[PDB]
Amino acid sequence: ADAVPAYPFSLPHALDLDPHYAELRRDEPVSRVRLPYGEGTAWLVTRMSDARIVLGDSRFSTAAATDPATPRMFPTPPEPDGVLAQDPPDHTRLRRLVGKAFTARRVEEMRPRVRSLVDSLLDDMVAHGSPADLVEFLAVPFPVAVICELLGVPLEDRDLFRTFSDAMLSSTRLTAAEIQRVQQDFMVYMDGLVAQRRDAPTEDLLGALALATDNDDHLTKGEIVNMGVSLLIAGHETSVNQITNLVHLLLTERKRYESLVADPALVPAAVEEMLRYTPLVSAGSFVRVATEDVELSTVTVRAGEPCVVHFASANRDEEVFDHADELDFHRERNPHIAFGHGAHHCIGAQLGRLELQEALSALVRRFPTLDLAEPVAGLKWKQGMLIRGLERQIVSW
Ligand code: HEM
Numbered sequence: 001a002d003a004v005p006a007y008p009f010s011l012p013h014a015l016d017l018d019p020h021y022a023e024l025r026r027d028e029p030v031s032r033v034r035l036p037y038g039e040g041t042a043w044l045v046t047r048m049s050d051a052r053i054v055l056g057d058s059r060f061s062t063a064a065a066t067d068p069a070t071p072r073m074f075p076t077p078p079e080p081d082g083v084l085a086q087d088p089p090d091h092t093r094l095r096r097l098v099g100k101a102f103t104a105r106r107v108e109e110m111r112p113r114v115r116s117l118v119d120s121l122l123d124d125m126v127a128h129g130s131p132a133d134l135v136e137f138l139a140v141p142f143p144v145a146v147i148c149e150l151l152g153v154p155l156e157d158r159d160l161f162r163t164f165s166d167a168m169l170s171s172t173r174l175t176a177a178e179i180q181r182v183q184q185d186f187m188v189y190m191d192g193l194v195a196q197r198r199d200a201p202t203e204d205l206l207g208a209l210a211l212a213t214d215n216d217d218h219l220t221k222g223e224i225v226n227m228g229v230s231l232l233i234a235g236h237e238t239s240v241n242q243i244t245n246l247v248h249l250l251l252t253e254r255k256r257y258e259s260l261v262a263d264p265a266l267v268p269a270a271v272e273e274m275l276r277y278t279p280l281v282s283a284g285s286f287v288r289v290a291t292e293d294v295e296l297s298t299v300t301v302r303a304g305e306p307c308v309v310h311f312a313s314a315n316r317d318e319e320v321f322d323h324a325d326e327l328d329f330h331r332e333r334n335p336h337i338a339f340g341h342g343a344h345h346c347i348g349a350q351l352g353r354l355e356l357q358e359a360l361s362a363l364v365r366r367f368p369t370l371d372l373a374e375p376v377a378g379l380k381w382k383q384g385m386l387i388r389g390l391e392r393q394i395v396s397w
């Protein structure tokens with residue numbers, strides 16, 4: 001009786017927002033759409049208080065989304081293993097157990113060694129000389145290296161992590177027969193690595209999860225193994241591409257970068273803005289299913305109905321933010337769900353931020369003359385992709 005528009009509404013341009021989300025926020029915050037895969041229609045959530053419910057409220061099952069027939073933004077139906085597709089109370093336990101060690105305090109204390117890692121990379125680049133591809137020298141290498149340091153991986157065998165990481169991306173460049181073998185090899189190493197943490201303690205994250213005080217809650221061996229793998233992947237692509245995404249915004253209006261060469265203390269406040277202002281997820285939600293009827297403004301979604309939150313839209317909610325379409329490094333408040341919200345609120349959110357602030361602070365500190373040496377018009381944005389990012393980024397300092 002009506003279109004049942006397909007979502008994604010359009011192929012994305014750069015880090016632009018389809019001008020439709022804006023119209024929906026006024027004309028229809030919660031509307032039916034058709035996701036590219038699965039079966040039936042679903043609810044595109046476009047505003048914050050609504051997204052906060054769909055991501056917040058216990059009456060929405062992600063583990064339900066595992067049904068091949070349930071809508072989704074990607075082709076291969078998610079395995080029910082994934083922590084993302086984990087309902088409580090089991091998920092709630094994973095988060096409690098992992099969250100006890102992945103404290104914000106562990107991440108802020110990593111900083112000094114994360115500063116020391118961006119430097120080795122910004123050396124390699126200055127060795128190459130200007131102009132240089134910021135993807136190659138910084139963004140690709142920096143995150144994987146950071147995670148290795150989180151897991152306390154010895155320097156040798158970090159190439160495995162890099163080999164396994166790149167074997168999981170969308171453009172893997174490797175066949176199904178290869179993906180199988182690298183998986184085994186990596187998992188077995190991780191197996192032995194967790195064993196070493198149990199037998200002989202360390203102080204890295206795995207180490208803290210591996211310890212077990214006798215009379216109280218701790219994780220199994222296979223859980224600890226898998227959490228590490230889960231963190232590794234979930235913080236790779238997002239951070240690789242989020243780095244180029246903030247540099248890209250920083251130079252395209254170069255008035256921005258110079259805002260931070262002027263007052264470096266803005267780097268953290270900046271990083272938050274750019275998280276809120278960047279469609280790192282082009283068309284968004286992992287689907288959520290109402291296990292009971294749930295009431296949003298303007299639409300009450302019924303038990304059994306799948307939903308999709310668009311993060312970056314909520315992040316531009318005209319009530320929540322002012323001049324949400326304009327990048328302001330001096331907002332008093334920044335309630336962005338760029339890290340998601342509620343149960344599945346990004347684990348690595350604090351680490352994510354550490355990484356960004358360290359990449360930008362270093363860039364400002366080492367290259368106040370940083371400039372995009374590629375013409376903007378030439379820029380190679382990644383195509384047909386789930387997470388937005390640049391293929392390439394020649395910069396000149
Ligand atoms: C700029 C960096 C990052 C961004 C923007 C980001 C964003 C997100 C978002 C939006 C979600 C929620 C997805 C949903 O509920 O549909 C999420 C989940 C997650 N992220 Fe990240 N992330 C980042 C970095 C990382 C890092 C560094 C790690 C690990 C070291 C990580 C691990 C995870 C995990 C495990 C989840 C699932 C948590 C759960 O379901 O309980 N992420 N991330």
Ligand SMILES: CC[C@H]1OC(=O)[C@H](C)[C@@H](O)[C@H](C)[C@@H](O)[C@@H](C)C[C@@H](C)C(=O)[C@H](C)[C@@H](O)[C@H]1C
Nearest residue numbers: 073074233234235237238281284285286386387
């Ligand atoms: C539909 C958009 C989502 O895509 C997906 O979940 C993909 C199917 C997953 O394979 C992605 C790529 C994961 O492997 C992780 C790298 C990131 C994941 C944990 C996120 O947090 C991320 C925000 C994610 O929800 C969105 C990209």
